[PDB]
Amino acid sequence: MKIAVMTDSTSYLSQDLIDKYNIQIAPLSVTFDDGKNFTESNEIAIEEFYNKMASSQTIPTTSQPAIGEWITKYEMLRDQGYTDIIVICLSSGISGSYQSSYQAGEMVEGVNVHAFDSKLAAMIEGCYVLRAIEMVEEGYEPQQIIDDLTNMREHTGLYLIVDDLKNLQKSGRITGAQAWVGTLLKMKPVLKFEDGKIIPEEKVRTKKRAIQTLEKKVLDIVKDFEEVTLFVINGDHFEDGQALYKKLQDDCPSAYQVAYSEFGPVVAAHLGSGGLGLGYVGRKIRLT
Numbered sequence: 001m002k003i004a005v006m007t008d009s010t011s012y013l014s015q016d017l018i019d020k021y022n023i024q025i026a027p028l029s030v031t032f033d034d035g036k037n038f039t040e041s042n043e044i045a046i047e048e049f050y051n052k053m054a055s056s057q058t059i060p061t062t063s064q065p066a067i068g069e070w071i072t073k074y075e076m077l078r079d080q081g082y083t084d085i086i087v088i089c090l091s092s093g094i095s096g097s098y099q100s101s102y103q104a105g106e107m108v109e110g111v112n113v114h115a116f117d118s119k120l121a122a123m124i125e126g127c128y129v130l131r132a133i134e135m136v137e138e139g140y141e142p143q144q145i146i147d148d149l150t151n152m153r154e155h156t157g158l159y160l161i162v163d164d165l166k167n168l169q170k171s172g173r174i175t176g177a178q179a180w181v182g183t184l185l186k187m188k189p190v191l192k193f194e195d196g197k198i199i200p201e202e203k204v205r206t207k208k209r210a211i212q213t214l215e216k217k218v219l220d221i222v223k224d225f226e227e228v229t230l231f232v233i234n235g236d237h238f239e240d241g242q243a244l245y246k247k248l249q250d251d252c253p254s255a256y257q258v259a260y261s262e263f264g265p266v267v268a269a270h271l272g273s274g275g276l277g278l279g280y281v282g283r284k285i286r287l288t
């Protein structure tokens, strides 16, 4: 028995972790109305996508990985001795990458495909990947890993801040004058993930209190966990994510695992500019 672990590109793992563990990636795409397509990878210039997103008069569309992209890596991993494949996917409540990962694995013979619904995104979804690899090396069989990843999912979440009432209007969720009810007013909607779905939490003015809202909300949850792994997931506002990341290191004991990361074009296409999140895991995930 040999078990492999792969995922889609929305888990935004570091290129070091991908290269070290040979993690195969099924990329998501984002197509603008200009005809230009950005296939998610660690080769694009994220700053130039943000400029293109601000350039484009309309917000682009997102697409899950093509079924053929899942197949070629599935049959590849099979064509090297892997008896089982664990697939951590983007949350099925927000995307169709989990549906395509299951159906494509049914069309690949010789290996047992195990699609997992992360019920989240970004490095929090990537934490499931690093936890699956850690268990495979320890000598765990697939359903033992899925049972653990299902248990880890019960103590895992992510809050996020949206600072782009602009981008919220070109998508049709707020009217033209509603942007001029928050932008001048500096109102920041605060959302959170629940059961794989993005539901509204609070609407805190100023980004500072909204960031302080993220800290107090996540710290009050993880204070009852035996193991804690925090992840600052920042957008194109570098100073905002670092201020929260540094404030966390000062306010949290070193027993807590505090990490920094950034999301890519697919997640940014829906968040816009200045997006910022804060996720947590009830486990001491191996990030090395």
Ligand SMILES: CCCCCCCCCCCCCC(=O)O
Pocket (backbone or CB within 6 Å): 028, 062, 063, 064, 090, 094, 095, 096, 097, 121, 122, 158, 159, 160, 233, 234, 263, 266, 267, 270, 271, 275, 276, 277, 278
């Ligand atoms: C930084 C906080 C994480 C925010 C995650 C936003 C996810 C919403 C975008 C949904 C992407 C759907 C992808 C697809 O079309 O298949």
